[PDB]
Amino acid sequence: MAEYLIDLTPRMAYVDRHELLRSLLTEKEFIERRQEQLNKSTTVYVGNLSFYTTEDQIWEHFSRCGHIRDLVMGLSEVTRTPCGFCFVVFESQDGAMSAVIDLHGTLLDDRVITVSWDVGCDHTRRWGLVHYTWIPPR
Amino acid sequence: RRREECVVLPPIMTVWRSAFSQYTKMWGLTKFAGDIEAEREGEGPILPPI
Amino acid sequence: YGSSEGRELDTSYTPKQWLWFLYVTSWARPFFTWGRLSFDELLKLSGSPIPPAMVSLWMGLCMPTDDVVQELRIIYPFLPRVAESTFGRALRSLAVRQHISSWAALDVLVRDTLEVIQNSEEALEGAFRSMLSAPLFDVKASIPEGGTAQVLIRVANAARLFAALSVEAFGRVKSECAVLLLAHINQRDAPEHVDARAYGVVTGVVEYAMAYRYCRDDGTGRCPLTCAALLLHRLVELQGIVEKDVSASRFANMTVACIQELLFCVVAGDTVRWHREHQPDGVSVCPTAARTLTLHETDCLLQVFIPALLQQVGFEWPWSESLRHAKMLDRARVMEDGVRLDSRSVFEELLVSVARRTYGLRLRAILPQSFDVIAENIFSSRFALPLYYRTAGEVLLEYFDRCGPSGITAEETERVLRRATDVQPMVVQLQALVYFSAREKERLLQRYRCEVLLASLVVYTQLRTVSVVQQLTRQLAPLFEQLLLPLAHERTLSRCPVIALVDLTPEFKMLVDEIHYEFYPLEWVPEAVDAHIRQEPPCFAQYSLFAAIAHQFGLVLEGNPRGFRGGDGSSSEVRTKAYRFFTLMLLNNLGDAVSSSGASFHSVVSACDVVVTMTQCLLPAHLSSHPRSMSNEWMRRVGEWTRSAYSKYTAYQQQVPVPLISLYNSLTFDSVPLARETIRAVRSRLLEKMSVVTASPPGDVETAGKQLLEQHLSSLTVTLTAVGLLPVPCATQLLWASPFFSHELLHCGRY
Ligand SMILES: CN1CN([C@@H]2O[C@H](COP(=O)(O)O)[C@@H](O)[C@H]2O)c2nc(N)[nH]c(=O)c21
Structure with a gap:
């Protein structure tokens, strides 16, 4: 299957101001341009993770889908502590496909998570108690 | 503000607690005597489901 | 659609x-x-x-x-x-x-x-x-x-x-x-x-x-x-x-x-x-x-x-x-x-x-x-410098703390590493110094520098955050590859340190006693055991940086006194540390991407390295812990252990279709589940990286990666046979006899 539910195609519903700031139409520009990026994306937004959930807990859950190339934790800018979400960049899109399918709405740390498809992370996106004092504030 | 105080378990869990209760009720499963003796609020606290 | x-x-x-x-x-x-x-x-x-x-x-x-x-x-x-x-x-x-x-x-x-x-x-x-x-x-x-x-x-x-x-x-x-x-x-x-x-x-x-x-x-x-x-x-x-x-x-x-x-x-x-x-x-x-x-x-x-x-x-x-x-x-x-x-x-x-x-x-x-x-x-848990690399790793820790993993650079790390090791008395002795070829001396000094670097990495990160571990391994991967370039698939010493009433080779004795050079036991203990059996280069003999670091941190995993029926015979601290190590520093760094944000991997960790690190961790604690002169005491310990194990093996052999519980067991792989998990996940990770590499557009770097991965697969099967997992006893038959795991690997159909 996955040949029958085409929802397997990576689609990201919301729109964001950096995409808004780029002067493109929300049709055939930001939405169409992102599809080529998302159609090759290996990255997922996790969502609803607790503030006290550690990277080991997120790794332990998402590593059963595939190798995690990079795991970026959301961080409140003022305190550099996890702010509720995360970004799990896998090695292959098979892992990201498994994470969105299998791990969406799945209990991670006594919190039901909202694994979705993202285009790719950047230090800017990582922002929005383990004090990540090693990450340069920005 | 303990980490367990901020744990609210999913509404599906009432099915699993009921399933555990039903599994123990038949096949003759009995808790440990000391565990049963935890009638002074010494038994395992259970997280609240919504 | x-x-x-x-x-x-x-x-x-x-x-x-x-x-x-x-x-x-x-x-x-x-x-x-x-x-x-x-x-x-x-x-x-x-x-x-x-x-x-x-x-x-x-x-x-x-x-x-x-x-x-x-x-x-x-x-x-x-x-x-x-x-x-x-x-x-x-x-x-x-x-x-x-x-x-x-x-x-x-x-x-x-x-x-x-x-x-x-x-x-x-x-x-x-x-x-x-x-x-x-x-x-x-x-x-x-x-x-x-x-x-x-x-x-x-x-x-x-x-x-x-x-x-x-x-x-x-x-x-x-x-x-x-x-x-x-x-x-x-x-x-x-x-x-x-x-x-x-x-x-x-x-x-x-x-x-x-x-x-x-x-x-x-x-x-x-x-x-x-x-x-x-x-x-x-x-x-x-x-x-x-x-x-x-x-x-x-x-x-x-x-x-x-x-x-x-x-x-x-x-x-x-x-x-x-x-x-x-x-x-x-x-x-x-x-x-x-x-x-x-x-x-x-x-x-x-x-x-x-x-x-x-x-x-x-x-x-x-x-x-x-x-x-x-x-x-x-x-x-x-x-x-x-x-x-x-x-x-x-x-x-x-x-x-x-x-x-x-x-x-x-x-x-x-x-x-x-x-x-x-x-x-199930619940000293920290990684600490083993008093080897302590004074050399303190400087590296001071640098790492000052800059942080974001600011850590390979070249500045190399500068600090050379500045710290060269001062240390053992390095001066080895550099200054019955016969030591210049190839052996550069081998022994590069090995010490790389061990100091990895020990400092493990201590600084504590292996607790996969992001920090992965980023630091990515930054220092060129340094590790440069340092293990001379070491590679070669024994650090020119000749086997066991000869012949069986004794250690004179330069090996000199290094252990006079110069205070620490060889992890897997380098010589199996050959010592095989000499002692004879009385009545091997793949693990080849150098592994992670085996050395595992031995230095005291990652000793063994079975239970109850026998096979137990298995979790190991301290909670050592088992938690060996998971955080055989999973982040080895398994998650095997075929891992060169940079953050596939098919482009740095060869800091090899499959053979993971296997031999497990075998080093599964050596008997009697033969793995250092005594308290030292070399001969260690060798006598090895000899008495070998006599005991030979007696046990002969007893099991005359005691004997045949159930695996009735065969001789070293309580090493059949006892510790982390061993079996890591051994299986090595091949799983290799095949997954093969799939990612093949999926990438055809070229030359992808072709090189594919050859590297098939070499890793072949090396994995050979290192397992070296341990005895894929087959008078032999030293491997006495140290890592694991009939259940051997039966699984001999019938899994993946080797
Ligand atoms: C709700 N979000 C939030 N988010 C990402 O999280 C980052 C931080 O969002 P907040 O500032 O709301 O915490 C943003 O840069 C945004 O791209 C998302 N990214 C993807 N792919 N999907 C989603 O549903 C969401």
Whole structure:
């Protein structure tokens, strides 16, 4: 299957101001341009993770889908502590496909998570108690 | 503000607690005597489901 | 449709797009109580097991009036991301052929699928056995259902083939596989048939997961057991939504009873038929195990499957009851590869696997007071410089603290590393200095520098955050590759440090005693043992940076005094550290990307390195801990240990188709589950990286990566034979004799 539910195609519903700031139409520009990026994306937004959930807990859950190339934790800018979400960049899109399918709405740390498809992370996106004092504030 | 105080378990869990209760009720499963003796609020606290 | 921001509904399909729709759906038809009817309409004739909200677009599609599909059947494509069985592919092919000719059905598809395999209900049982084979012996027995129940046996025997085929075909999409399993279960044939269907589905999913993880190589990096656990949880959740319109609680009860039956069979070591002897009324289906559990299946359940399920259910289980009845099963009294483990061991393994997904407070709150001994056993935990590399690694730590992993650079790290080592007295002695070739001296000094670098890395990171560990390994990967360039697959000393009344080589003695150079025991202890056996270069002899660092940090893993029946004989601190090390520093760095944000990997960690690090960690603590002159004391220790082990081996040999529990065991791999997990995951990671590299556009760097990965695979098989896992005793036969793990690797079909 996955040949029958085409929802397997990576689609990201919301729109964001950096995409808004780029002067493109929300049709055939930001939405169409992102599809080529998302159609090759290996990255997922996790969502609803607790503030006290550690990277080991997120790794332990998402590593059963595939190798995690990079795991970026959301961080409140003022305190550099996890702010509720995360970004799990896998090695292959098979892992990201498994994470969105299998791990969406799945209990991670006594919190039901909202694994979705993202285009790719950047230090800017990582922002929005383990004090990540090693990450340069920005 | 303990980490367990901020744990609210999913509404599906009432099915699993009921399933555990039903599994123990038949096949003759009995808790440990000391565990049963935890009638002074010494038994395992259970997280609240919504 | 694909590559689109909006989903388009189904349209008229060409006969190509039909063969595929049929290949991935036609098999499911014979399993329900007419051709030309769409799956939603065919389910209406089965009592509409699934509500309209859960039905999918594909179930809406009706059959076309094409006679081209009739003639193009006279080889079908391959489903993505799964290792399809020869029976499953044959069954789906004959399903399409017999659905076209459709334009007793199940019994003829299974009989006709079997003939295809074995040319050029026992049938519905041999079908499941053929599905789970590279023959599989069924873990859970269907014949134990009651009196006058040939119909119920067939209903479950078909739910097992249906669940197997449904995870083989619908598995990547969990929601769709769960809706197809609910549809099969919730047929309205009879209320007593629902329990049999649920039992068949749960047992089939579990057995398929465990057989897939043993003999199926698909190179996807997705754990079959976690997927099975999430699928069974999704089944329960989806039966909950059907119920809010038999019961979600009942399916959950079979899932638990099937897990508890497996646990009790592991603890009892024999088919005690615990639920059969505890039946409430007899009419109810009670899961029984048809045989004991192989070590691989026990590792699957206690390390992946049950911990994942428990995480899904908030770590809540019938904990006190299970521990009590497992303890009763302990005081009791077969299959060659079957295993018995004590309750303490079983629940210790289960809770250490579970504790990685949570924290100590949650397990403390959940677990009753009867688990206090278990909790204390599963809960100095930090990595500390081993007083070797201490004064050299302090400078590196001061640099790392000052800059941080974000600011750490390879060249500045190299400068600080040389500035710190060269000062140290041992480096001055080695540099200044019966004969030492310049090649040996640069080898011994580069080895010390790399060991200092890795020890400083492990101490600074504490191996607690995978992001920091991965970023630091990525930054320092050129430095590590440059430092291990001279070392490579070569022994640090020119000649073996054991000669001949067997003694150590004079330059080796000089290094250990006068210069205070520390060689990890795996470099010389096996050769010493083999000399001592003779009295009455090896792959592990070749240098491994991670073996040295593991020995320095005291990562000693061993078995239990109770024998094989235990296994978790190791301190909690050392076991937690060896997980955080054999999983972050080795497994997650094997074939890992050169940069953050695939197919471009740095060779800091090799497969042979992981295997030899496990073997070093599994050396006896008597032979691994340094004494308190030192060299001869160590050698005498080795000699007396070898005499004792030879006596034990000869006793076992005269004590003896033959059960593996009755053969000589070193309690190294058959005892520690971290060893087996790491050894399997090495090959799994290599195959996954192979798939990613091949998927990348063809070129030259991809070709180099592919050759590197096949070299890693070949080196992995050779290093395992070096240990004895793939075969008067030999030193490897006395240090790492692991008949259960050896039997698994010799019959897994992956080496
Ligand atoms: C809700 N979000 C938030 N989010 C990302 O999270 C980052 C931080 O969002 P907040 O500032 O709301 O925490 C943003 O840069 C945004 O791209 C998301 N990214 C993806 N792909 N999908 C989603 O549903 C969401």
